[PDB]
Write an enzyme that holds these catalytic residues in place. Structure first.
Site, PDB file in Angstrom:
ATOM      1  N   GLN A   1       0.907  -1.169  -0.135  1.00  0.00           N
ATOM      2  CA  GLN A   1       0.102   0.025   0.230  1.00  0.00           C
ATOM      3  C   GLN A   1       0.916   1.204   0.106  1.00  0.00           C
ATOM      4  O   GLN A   1       1.872   1.216   0.479  1.00  0.00           O
ATOM      5  CB  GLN A   1      -1.018  -0.021   0.979  1.00  0.00           C
TER       6      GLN A   1
ATOM      7  N   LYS B   1       1.249  -1.743 -10.356  1.00  0.00           N
ATOM      8  CA  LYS B   1       0.948  -0.356  -9.498  1.00  0.00           C
ATOM      9  C   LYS B   1      -0.139   0.331 -10.095  1.00  0.00           C
ATOM     10  O   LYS B   1      -0.374   0.699 -11.122  1.00  0.00           O
ATOM     11  CB  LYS B   1       2.256   0.383  -9.830  1.00  0.00           C
TER      12      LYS B   1
ATOM     13  N   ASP C   1      17.759   6.082  -4.515  1.00  0.00           N
ATOM     14  CA  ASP C   1      17.160   5.275  -3.349  1.00  0.00           C
ATOM     15  C   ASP C   1      17.607   3.777  -3.578  1.00  0.00           C
ATOM     16  O   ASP C   1      16.842   3.092  -3.336  1.00  0.00           O
ATOM     17  CB  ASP C   1      15.516   5.464  -3.063  1.00  0.00           C
TER      18      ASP C   1
ATOM     19  N   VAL D   1       0.551  -1.816  -4.737  1.00  0.00           N
ATOM     20  CA  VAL D   1       1.027  -3.005  -5.592  1.00  0.00           C
ATOM     21  C   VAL D   1       0.396  -4.279  -5.502  1.00  0.00           C
ATOM     22  O   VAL D   1       0.121  -4.730  -4.272  1.00  0.00           O
ATOM     23  CB  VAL D   1       2.551  -2.875  -5.289  1.00  0.00           C
TER      24      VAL D   1
ATOM     25  N   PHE E   1       0.275   7.085  -2.673  1.00  0.00           N
ATOM     26  CA  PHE E   1      -0.298   7.205  -4.081  1.00  0.00           C
ATOM     27  C   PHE E   1      -0.955   6.030  -4.647  1.00  0.00           C
ATOM     28  O   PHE E   1      -1.865   6.088  -5.797  1.00  0.00           O
ATOM     29  CB  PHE E   1       0.651   7.548  -4.915  1.00  0.00           C
TER      30      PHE E   1
HETATM   31  C1  LIG Z   1       4.425  -2.787 -10.678  1.00  0.00           C
HETATM   32  C2  LIG Z   1       5.738  -1.917 -10.715  1.00  0.00           C
HETATM   33  C3  LIG Z   1       5.922  -0.647 -11.312  1.00  0.00           C
HETATM   34  C4  LIG Z   1       7.194  -0.072 -11.429  1.00  0.00           C
HETATM   35  C5  LIG Z   1       8.252  -0.642 -10.621  1.00  0.00           C
HETATM   36  C6  LIG Z   1       9.554   0.169 -10.733  1.00  0.00           C
HETATM   37  O1  LIG Z   1      10.601  -0.435 -10.095  1.00  0.00           O
HETATM   38  N1  LIG Z   1       9.810   1.295 -11.514  1.00  0.00           N
HETATM   39  C7  LIG Z   1      10.994   2.187 -11.894  1.00  0.00           C
HETATM   40  C8  LIG Z   1      10.943   3.450 -12.060  1.00  0.00           C
HETATM   41  C9  LIG Z   1      12.193   4.292 -12.228  1.00  0.00           C
HETATM   42  C10 LIG Z   1      13.249   3.414 -12.314  1.00  0.00           C
HETATM   43  C11 LIG Z   1      14.559   4.392 -12.477  1.00  0.00           C
HETATM   44  N2  LIG Z   1      14.484   5.453 -12.041  1.00  0.00           N
HETATM   45  C12 LIG Z   1      14.537   5.568 -10.640  1.00  0.00           C
HETATM   46  C13 LIG Z   1      14.324   7.276 -10.214  1.00  0.00           C
HETATM   47  N3  LIG Z   1      15.588   7.987 -10.823  1.00  0.00           N
HETATM   48  C14 LIG Z   1      15.358   9.187 -10.361  1.00  0.00           C
HETATM   49  C15 LIG Z   1      15.519   7.819 -12.125  1.00  0.00           C
HETATM   50  C16 LIG Z   1      15.241   6.367 -12.696  1.00  0.00           C
HETATM   51  C17 LIG Z   1      13.405   1.963 -12.036  1.00  0.00           C
HETATM   52  C18 LIG Z   1      14.660   1.323 -12.054  1.00  0.00           C
HETATM   53  F1  LIG Z   1      14.631  -0.119 -11.955  1.00  0.00           F
HETATM   54  F2  LIG Z   1      15.346   1.349 -13.037  1.00  0.00           F
HETATM   55  F3  LIG Z   1      15.405   1.945 -11.151  1.00  0.00           F
HETATM   56  C19 LIG Z   1      12.212   1.196 -11.788  1.00  0.00           C
HETATM   57  C20 LIG Z   1       8.344  -1.706  -9.967  1.00  0.00           C
HETATM   58  C21 LIG Z   1       7.070  -2.397 -10.206  1.00  0.00           C
HETATM   59  C22 LIG Z   1       6.802  -4.017  -9.426  1.00  0.00           C
HETATM   60  C23 LIG Z   1       6.795  -4.986  -8.757  1.00  0.00           C
HETATM   61  C24 LIG Z   1       6.939  -6.165  -7.905  1.00  0.00           C
HETATM   62  C25 LIG Z   1       7.203  -7.063  -8.746  1.00  0.00           C
HETATM   63  N4  LIG Z   1       7.444  -8.054  -8.354  1.00  0.00           N
HETATM   64  C26 LIG Z   1       7.062  -8.017  -7.052  1.00  0.00           C
HETATM   65  C27 LIG Z   1       7.041  -8.750  -5.804  1.00  0.00           C
HETATM   66  C28 LIG Z   1       6.533  -8.232  -4.606  1.00  0.00           C
HETATM   67  C29 LIG Z   1       6.208  -7.063  -4.541  1.00  0.00           C
HETATM   68  N5  LIG Z   1       6.610  -6.222  -5.514  1.00  0.00           N
HETATM   69  N6  LIG Z   1       6.867  -6.599  -6.721  1.00  0.00           N
END
Ligand SMILES: Cc1ccc(C(=O)Nc2ccc(CN3CCN(C)CC3)c(C(F)(F)F)c2)cc1C#Cc1cnc2cccnn12
EC number: 2.7.10.2
Length: 261
Positions: free
Chosen positions: A19, A39, A130, A25, A22
């Site tokens: 949760q 998401k 992060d 998941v 915004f």
């Molecule tokens: C649904 C979903 C949507 C989005 C994202 C996500 O990570 N988006 C993301 C956005 C930006 C960036 C890079 N920027 C970071 C900031 N930065 C300033 C610029 C670059 C990256 C990165 F991976 F490249 F880092 C990722 C993950 C999930 C998930 C999931 C999930 C999948 N399995 C499981 C199992 C259990 C629990 N959760 N789960």
């Protein structure tokens, strides 16, 4: 009006995994066949345009060590759909039942995978901001992938970023050194017993975490390279990836298993 768009009826939400302020998941299914993570955006909680920028960034990133965008439903209610990672966050994985079986070869391999994903981030001139075990996901066969859940993690942030807003790939390298302590302590919070205010002042004075129990000094030396005060003196992720891949031949050829690492 995009090749990423999918019909609302092709996506089923099955289990709530998290949760947030915004949205949520979920684990679910896409097209009846593909297990996915989803998401959601709470209507009226954040600008749809602001939420969708995440999807725009993920459309440009594609690497085996970064969680992969699969699909978007881009009008309110908005959904972002990715691959599913069956073991959840690395933090939970380390703290939970599996922690007791992970030893240094598995943990270093996991670190090497994360470094590979961040080496791709580095090559692409992005910055994570992060990096920490709560933002790493784990799958079958100990696969690890970089993620971002938009989660102040002063304990993981390089001092020039925390104090002056200087977030760069080199402040991610600092965070990676902190993540190495989370791996080698099976998920404990860094700087144990210190609050944020003590950490920032202690680190500014030159304090660094000591070598964790049973961790080789050569891996703590690597952490300390990630924690150099001057950011340009920290190693690249390309270097970190190669070091960790080769670790048990080039750096610790006479490693022997212990009780915890
Ligand atoms: C649904 C979903 C949507 C989005 C994202 C996500 O990570 N988006 C993301 C956005 C930006 C960036 C890079 N920027 C970071 C900031 N930065 C300033 C610029 C670059 C990256 C990165 F991976 F490249 F880092 C990722 C993950 C999930 C998930 C999931 C999930 C999948 N399995 C499981 C199992 C259990 C629990 N959760 N789960």
């Amino acid at each position: 009006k995009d090749a990423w768009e999918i019909p609302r009826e092709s996506l089923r939400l099955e289990v709530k995994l998290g949760q947030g302020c915004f949205g949520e998941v979920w684990m679910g299914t896409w097209n009846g066949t593909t297990r996915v993570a989803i998401k959601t955006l709470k209507p009226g909680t954040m600008s749809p345009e602001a939420f969708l920028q995440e999807a725009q960034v993920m459309k440009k990133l594609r690497h085996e060590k970064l969680v992969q965008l699969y699909a978007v439903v881009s009008e309110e209610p908005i959904y972002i759909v990715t691959e599913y990672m069956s073991k959840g966050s690395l933090l939970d994985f380390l703290k939970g039942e599996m922690g007791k079986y992970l030893r240094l070869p598995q943990l270093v391999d996991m670190a090497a995978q994360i470094a590979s994903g961040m080496a791709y981030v580095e090559r692409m001139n992005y910055v994570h901001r992060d990096l920490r075990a709560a933002n790493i996901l784990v799958g079958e066969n100990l696969v690890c992938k970089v993620a971002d859940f938009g989660l102040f993690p002063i304990k993981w942030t390089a001092p020039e970023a925390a104090l002056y807003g200087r977030f760069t790939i080199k402040s991610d390298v600092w965070s990676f050194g902190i993540l190495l302590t989370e791996l080698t302590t099976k998920g404990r919070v860094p700087y144990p017993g210190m609050v944020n205010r003590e950490v920032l002042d202690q680190v500014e004075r030159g304090y660094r975490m000591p070598c964790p129990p049973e961790c080789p000094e050569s891996l703590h030396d690597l952490m300390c390279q990630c924690w150099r005060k001057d950011p340009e003196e920290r190693p690249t992720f390309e270097y970190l990836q190669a070091f960790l891949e080769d670790y048990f031949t080039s750096t610790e050829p006479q490693y022997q298993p212990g009780e915890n690492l």
